[PDB]
Design a protein around this ligand. Structure first.
Ligand SMILES: Cc1ncc(COP(=O)(O)O)c(C=O)c1O
Ligand SMILES: Cc1ncc(COP(=O)(O)O)c(C=O)c1O
Lengths: 385, 386
């Protein structure tokens, strides 16, 4: 057992976050899924996790003679030490330079540490990813949250607070909405602002050969920074920073997680190249996903639910905790497993049960989700928003 | 597309005062390129397991099995049937109650501190404690109170002044190789009703019975509240772990931001760690060898009149200012010895370290050569040593 100043916090937490739930667990933890159940919890959009060629390429490079490169990524910043995958990924998205990181989180935290000073203006969408808020808070930037995809509010804020960095998800993790990138590019140009787009949820699923949403819209050359977790479509535990400028020569010596935390091992980079080749040609998978996503969005919204989504991420709005619990349990009972997003990913009264669709989902399964929600809507134990 | 000036400012000033001010036009950590026959002492893989055929075998095998698509937060994986076996076994290995996996050692410490701190929680931290510990506390808005390196008297005053808090240390320090007074710190922990957090990143696997670490060696396991480690040192893997002698690991996966918003380790990674743990548990031979070689180097170098604070496989050469450090590095590299430059923000500007990290594949001959090269450096070298 523990001294009071920690224990008090730990008792309170357990009481207000575990004990209050019908199952005694934290709200995200439901029951165990069957193999027959529809699992919509994974960020692996193109269902690549178990792809034979990717597995083969990693195992192969894993079995080669690994040189003992257990140290920071900064010690490996010479051209000969810099992996082929960065050059290819840069080429892929159309950005100048690409830098590998240990995760999407670290890419965001790192980039924001490099370009920010205390009280730097950071104009960040209300619903942008936590990695981005925390990036900015670590750097002691001045956060100026703006209302979701609301360009008028952003205009007011910049005009009020001066030039800064405008930070957005291209596709938002909780809601599946799409940022207004064309208008956001105009705005940054107009006010002398830097623009940072986190493409974690569009990279691979969107754009030509899956090069992303900036690449789809034709905006690549008009943006300063893009970051992305490689743990979504790229199905790998890593991240990347892209620059249309020379910031990537500096990140490795300034970012604390790049300086003080160990780099990706050489065999990990070769795993990604194969993945890239597979993503690059997965037009069918990209298109199937897009079809199913829409079919699900249409069917759910017509039942009266707010489906803000315009993508493969679909957020059922379930309100308060007690309600969310009731919705989770009902869905799971009927073989539908989404992921509870509660605090601090959300406000405590605007919970989301997120459905991450992937290219392996079929029409029959889409039909089932709709029907389950349609039955929900008349069972009488809960509400949607 | 043009960067606004308040960015370009910082970048231009950085490239200038950090790349351009250096002889070879690159950052101070980048020397000349090493070759085959040089002696490399930069790796953290102290038991030289990186290339171990059995680890590579088990890892490849595990990856080839059918993967269920687990690309999500570890939050969603905290049901007992989702929790990996490596935790139970890592716990049992160190003697700690519960163990929790993390994506890095850095995250390990951030996660834990965010869980146990409230704003204005006293954190008595060693000056030389790892950056991850400082930042861990700073992200949790804790009151951080720095005590002088390995100084119990200083620590005592601070606690008397500000009250009960968390005492935070490395067991073996990352830039100096020094060893904390763990026994004494446990006393103070008791003398003032505090909690103790030890990072064993550089002792775990190299020290204790079967490499269970320094706390296990000194039999302090049951009286320490928290331990953490990077698995990227001796364990030769990109991951982290948090051990607790209490219920804290029940909450970390749901409170810690790195644990909520960053993807988990994939199941096959966990498997590869089990095999590492087995190998380490039996690697008495390599631990004994590495202990002896380190001792030779420490003794060897001190005789030259050098400050060697070290008591472990990590030896820190103290090179003072940046200009000088560049000289010592260029000299040591010229004669076949490759350490790691440790400059700011890892050190204060005028107190740089070149860090020689030993491993179990270093032999007598190489030690003799490292000692010999440092002798020449002490004598004919156009530079000093703090
Ligand atoms: C004492 C200590 N703790 C934690 C870490 C961070 O480890 P990781 O690279 O796994 O994040 C290190 C540095 O690498 C370390 O020296
Ligand atoms: C928009 C967004 N950015 C960043 C991340 C963090 O990525 P990672 O898991 O690789 O740290 C995620 C969440 O996983 C995300 O959804």
């Amino acid at each position: 057992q523990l001294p009071d100043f920690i224990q008090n916090k730990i008792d309170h937490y357990i009481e207000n976050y575990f004990d209050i739930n019908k199952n005694g667990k934290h709200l995200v933890l439901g029951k165990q899924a069957s193999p027959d159940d529809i699992i919509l919890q994974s960020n692996d959009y193109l269902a690549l996790a178990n792809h034979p060629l990717i597995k083969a390429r990693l195992a192969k490079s894993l079995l080669e003679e690994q040189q003992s490169l257990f140290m920071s990524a900064s010690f490996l910043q010479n051209d000969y030490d810099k992996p082929m995958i960065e050059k290819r990924l840069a080429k892929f998205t159309g950005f100048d330079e690409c830098l590998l990181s240990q995760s999407g989180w670290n890419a965001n935290v790192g980039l924001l540490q490099t370009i920010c000073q205390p009280n730097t203006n950071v104009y960040i969408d209300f619903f942008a990813h936590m990695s981005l808020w925390e990036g900015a808070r670590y750097a002691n930037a001045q956060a100026h949250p703006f209302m979701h995809n609301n360009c008028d509010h952003l205009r007011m804020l910049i005009q009020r607070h001066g030039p800064g960095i405008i930070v957005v998800d291209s596709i938002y993790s909780t809601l599946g909405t799409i940022a207004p990138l064309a208008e956001l590019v105009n705005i940054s140009k107009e006010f002398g602002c830097a623009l940072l787009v986190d493409e974690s949820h569009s990279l691979g699923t969107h754009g030509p050969n899956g090069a992303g949403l900036l690449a789809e819209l034709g905006l690549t050359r008009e943006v300063h920074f893009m970051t992305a977790s490689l743990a979504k479509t790229f199905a790998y535990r890593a991240g990347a920073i892209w620059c249309n400028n020379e910031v990537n020569r500096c990140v490795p010596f300034i970012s604390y997680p790049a300086i003080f935390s160990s780099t990706l091992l050489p065999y990990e980079a070769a795993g990604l190249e194969t993945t890239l080749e597979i993503i690059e040609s997965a037009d069918n998978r990209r298109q199937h996903l897009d079809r199913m996503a829409r079919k699900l969005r249409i069917g759910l919204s017509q039942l009266g639910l707010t489906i803000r989504s315009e993508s493969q991420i679909i957020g059922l709005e379930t309100g308060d905790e007690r309600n969310t619990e009731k919705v989770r349990d009902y869905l799971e009972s009927n073989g539908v497993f989404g992921s509870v997003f509660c605090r601090p990913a959300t406000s405590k009264n605007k919970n989301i049960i997120r459905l991450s669709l992937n290219s392996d989902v079929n029409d029959e399964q889409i039909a089932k989700i709709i029907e389950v929600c349609s039955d929900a809507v008349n069972y009488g134990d809960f509400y949607f928003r």
